[PDB]
Ligand binder design. Structure first.
Ligand SMILES: NC(=O)[C@H]1CCC(=O)N(Cc2cccc3c2OCC3)C1
Ligand SMILES: [Zn+2]
Length: 140
């Protein structure tokens, strides 16, 4: 689990969104595994606006924050899971590291702010859904 809180927006993994998130939906994309909903209170997170390929992510299944090198956002084949059939997921970045399904939502951050959230894993790899291209998260 986990979310990003920026301005009056809440960013979560689409597969973990609640009834309230869908009722207050701003934008969602199944191919990215992302959903953004509106909030009443102001958030305190800052979204990175950069092309960084190094950062730190939180891994709940190890209670640890790991420094990682990660790939640029791309279209990557993701195996079938409990929440989606086998498909290509877009805007996905991979790193060598540990990930289990319940780790989804863990933040990846660089010196500029939040880069994305954990979304995939397996085979000693961890994948993150990028949010740095969602420029509208910085306004209204
Ligand atoms: N973005 C997706 O398609 C998600 C949907 C929910 C989900 O359980 N997975 C599989 C998954 C995620 C993280 C870690 C691991 C996983 O499988 C093995 C280790 C993929
Ligand atoms: Zn950065």
């Amino acid at each position: 689990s986990g979310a990003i809180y920026v301005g009056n927006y809440r960013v979560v993994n689409r597969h973990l969104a609640t009834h309230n998130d869908w009722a207050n939906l701003v934008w969602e994309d199944s191919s990215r595994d992302l959903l953004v909903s509106s909030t009443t209170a102001q958030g305190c997170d800052t979204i990175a606006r950069c092309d960084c390929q190094t950062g730190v992510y939180y891994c709940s299944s190890r209670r640890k924050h790991y420094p990682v090198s990660f790939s640029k956002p791309s279209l990557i084949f993701v195996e079938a899971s409990e929440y989606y059939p086998a498909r290509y997921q877009s805007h996905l970045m991979l790193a060598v590291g540990h990930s289990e399904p319940g780790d989804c939502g863990g933040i990846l951050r660089c010196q500029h702010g939040v880069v994305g959230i954990v979304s995939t894993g397996g085979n000693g790899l961890v994948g993150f859904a990028d949010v740095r291209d969602l420029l509208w998260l910085d306004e209204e």
